[PDB]
Short mmCIF file of C-alpha atoms in Angstrom, two decimals:
data_model
loop_
_atom_site.label_atom_id
_atom_site.label_comp_id
_atom_site.label_asym_id
_atom_site.label_seq_id
_atom_site.Cartn_x
_atom_site.Cartn_y
_atom_site.Cartn_z
CA UNK E 1 -105.74 -147.31 31.92
CA UNK E 2 -105.98 -143.99 29.80
CA UNK E 3 -106.61 -143.57 26.04
CA UNK E 4 -104.09 -143.31 23.26
CA UNK E 5 -103.13 -139.58 24.03
CA UNK E 6 -103.27 -140.28 27.83
CA UNK E 7 -105.72 -137.36 28.21
CA UNK E 8 -108.44 -139.52 29.82
CA UNK E 9 -109.67 -143.00 30.24
CA UNK E 10 -111.73 -145.09 28.09
CA UNK E 11 -115.52 -144.29 27.94
CA UNK E 12 -116.83 -147.78 27.60
CA UNK E 13 -116.40 -150.79 29.73
CA UNK E 14 -114.33 -153.52 28.21
CA UNK E 15 -114.16 -157.24 28.20
CA UNK E 16 -110.99 -159.32 27.91
CA UNK E 17 -109.95 -160.46 24.46
CA UNK E 18 -107.23 -162.52 22.74
CA UNK E 19 -104.98 -159.43 22.34
CA UNK E 20 -104.27 -158.11 25.78
CA UNK E 21 -102.95 -154.80 24.19
CA UNK E 22 -106.25 -153.97 22.66
CA UNK E 23 -109.59 -152.68 24.22
CA UNK E 24 -112.57 -155.02 23.38
CA UNK E 25 -116.42 -154.34 23.90
CA UNK E 26 -119.19 -156.59 23.94
CA UNK E 27 -122.24 -156.49 21.65
CA UNK E 28 -124.32 -155.44 24.74
CA UNK E 29 -122.14 -152.29 25.21
CA UNK E 30 -122.25 -151.80 21.55
CA UNK E 31 -126.03 -151.73 21.53
CA UNK E 32 -126.22 -149.41 24.37
CA UNK E 33 -124.01 -146.84 22.32
CA UNK E 34 -126.34 -147.27 19.42
CA UNK E 35 -129.24 -146.69 21.87
CA UNK E 36 -127.81 -143.18 22.43
CA UNK E 37 -126.29 -143.74 25.80
CA UNK E 38 -123.34 -141.53 25.34
CA UNK E 39 -124.82 -139.28 22.74
CA UNK E 40 -123.69 -136.23 24.97
CA UNK E 41 -120.09 -137.30 25.26
CA UNK E 42 -119.33 -138.51 21.66
CA UNK E 43 -118.60 -136.08 18.69
CA UNK E 44 -118.11 -138.86 16.26
CA UNK E 45 -118.66 -142.71 16.52
CA UNK E 46 -117.00 -144.70 13.68
CA UNK E 47 -117.73 -148.33 13.38
CA UNK E 48 -115.24 -149.89 10.78
CA UNK E 49 -116.56 -153.16 9.17
CA UNK E 50 -113.49 -155.01 7.77
CA UNK E 51 -115.50 -157.74 6.06
CA UNK E 52 -115.74 -158.40 2.39
CA UNK E 53 -118.07 -155.97 0.72
CA UNK E 54 -120.30 -158.78 -0.20
CA UNK E 55 -120.83 -159.76 3.48
CA UNK E 56 -121.23 -156.23 4.56
CA UNK E 57 -123.86 -155.57 1.78
CA UNK E 58 -125.88 -158.33 3.13
CA UNK E 59 -126.18 -156.97 6.58
CA UNK E 60 -123.95 -154.70 8.69
CA UNK E 61 -124.11 -152.80 12.02
CA UNK E 62 -126.20 -149.52 11.22
CA UNK E 63 -123.75 -146.74 10.39
CA UNK E 64 -120.71 -149.01 9.93
CA UNK E 65 -118.41 -148.23 7.14
CA UNK E 66 -116.86 -151.07 5.14
CA UNK E 67 -113.06 -150.80 4.95
CA UNK E 68 -111.71 -154.06 4.07
CA UNK E 69 -108.25 -153.11 2.74
CA UNK E 70 -105.45 -151.31 4.58
CA UNK E 71 -105.43 -148.73 1.69
CA UNK E 72 -109.23 -148.09 2.17
CA UNK E 73 -108.54 -147.48 5.80
CA UNK E 74 -105.58 -145.12 4.88
CA UNK E 75 -107.82 -143.11 2.56
CA UNK E 76 -110.75 -142.98 4.96
CA UNK E 77 -109.68 -142.40 8.48
CA UNK E 78 -106.16 -141.24 8.09
CA UNK E 79 -106.61 -139.00 5.14
CA UNK E 80 -109.33 -136.73 6.43
CA UNK E 81 -108.63 -136.03 10.12
CA UNK E 82 -109.04 -133.38 12.90
CA UNK E 83 -112.71 -131.76 12.39
CA UNK E 84 -114.37 -129.96 15.39
CA UNK E 85 -112.74 -131.91 18.17
CA UNK E 86 -114.70 -129.73 20.72
CA UNK E 87 -113.77 -131.67 23.84
CA UNK E 88 -116.10 -134.53 23.05
CA UNK E 89 -114.87 -137.86 22.12
CA UNK E 90 -113.99 -139.44 18.73
CA UNK E 91 -114.36 -143.21 19.06
CA UNK E 92 -113.64 -146.02 16.37
CA UNK E 93 -114.81 -149.62 16.73
CA UNK E 94 -113.37 -152.32 14.37
CA UNK E 95 -114.71 -155.65 13.74
CA UNK E 96 -114.71 -158.33 11.07
CA UNK E 97 -115.98 -161.80 10.86
CA UNK E 98 -115.52 -163.03 14.45
CA UNK E 99 -113.33 -160.15 15.18
CA UNK E 100 -110.18 -162.31 15.07
CA UNK E 101 -107.08 -161.09 13.06
CA UNK E 102 -108.25 -158.67 10.47
CA UNK E 103 -110.16 -156.66 12.99
CA UNK E 104 -107.19 -156.41 15.45
CA UNK E 105 -104.69 -155.92 12.66
CA UNK E 106 -106.63 -152.77 11.21
CA UNK E 107 -106.97 -151.44 14.61
CA UNK E 108 -103.21 -151.60 15.30
CA UNK E 109 -102.62 -150.27 11.69
CA UNK E 110 -104.69 -147.21 12.36
CA UNK E 111 -103.00 -146.50 15.62
CA UNK E 112 -99.45 -146.83 14.09
CA UNK E 113 -100.20 -144.46 11.01
CA UNK E 114 -101.86 -142.16 13.46
CA UNK E 115 -98.76 -142.18 15.77
CA UNK E 116 -96.53 -141.53 12.58
CA UNK E 117 -98.21 -138.50 11.58
CA UNK E 118 -98.29 -136.91 14.97
CA UNK E 119 -96.26 -135.54 17.86
CA UNK E 120 -96.26 -137.98 20.74
CA UNK E 121 -98.89 -138.66 22.23
CA UNK E 122 -101.31 -136.80 20.16
CA UNK E 123 -103.69 -138.95 18.02
CA UNK E 124 -106.55 -138.12 15.66
CA UNK E 125 -108.09 -141.38 17.03
CA UNK E 126 -107.04 -141.67 20.42
CA UNK E 127 -109.76 -144.20 21.40
CA UNK E 128 -110.21 -147.46 19.45
CA UNK E 129 -112.12 -150.69 20.25
CA UNK E 130 -112.50 -154.06 18.72
CA UNK E 131 -116.11 -155.65 18.87
CA UNK E 132 -115.64 -158.97 20.71
CA UNK E 133 -117.37 -161.78 18.54
CA UNK E 134 -117.60 -159.62 15.50
CA UNK E 135 -120.73 -159.37 13.39
CA UNK E 136 -121.89 -162.99 13.96
CA UNK E 137 -122.46 -162.58 17.78
CA UNK E 138 -123.74 -158.88 17.34
CA UNK E 139 -126.18 -160.15 14.79
CA UNK E 140 -127.66 -163.04 16.83
CA UNK E 141 -128.08 -160.87 19.89
CA UNK E 142 -128.86 -157.42 18.21
CA UNK E 143 -130.72 -158.22 14.97
CA UNK E 144 -132.55 -154.84 15.21
CA UNK E 145 -129.51 -152.75 15.16
CA UNK E 146 -128.27 -154.31 11.87
CA UNK E 147 -128.96 -152.95 8.27
CA UNK E 148 -130.39 -154.78 6.58
CA UNK E 149 -131.43 -156.94 9.58
CA UNK E 150 -129.76 -160.06 7.81
CA UNK E 151 -126.41 -161.96 7.89
CA UNK E 152 -124.70 -162.81 4.68
CA UNK E 153 -121.56 -164.73 5.23
CA UNK E 154 -118.83 -165.73 2.68
CA UNK E 155 -118.66 -169.31 1.50
CA UNK E 156 -115.82 -171.66 2.55
CA UNK E 157 -114.32 -174.57 1.02
CA UNK E 158 -115.67 -177.94 2.25
CA UNK E 159 -112.73 -179.54 0.26
CA UNK E 160 -110.24 -180.61 3.03
CA UNK E 161 -110.62 -184.36 2.08
#
């Protein structure tokens, strides 16, 4: 279908994901954008890494911004909008650990807040995607696009005994 403001269709190809109401992209598509594939069509490409700052610091997609809390997302994306829209696309990609729950949640959060502060169907961020597989998959497949080229996951409790 079309993007959030119904003015055009999605630029990237999408893969099926858990939440059928959202658009997912694979690490291959993600890597191609980073290779500059759509440089001429995109005004701003925002990659929102929702992981804990410590994970993010240990290795994140190059150019990604760490916005772990809804309040940070509010301040970052939603507080400073508009900019020279110029007819080119503004795209935001969201991901977390394995892009399950926090990623999709933040994505829906940005849309709702955007909707609220606008007259239907205008949006400052009419095109949003969730990176399928999160940073884990992307790292294993596209380590060279990560900064630093490392992966530092959080610890989990082995206590369940």
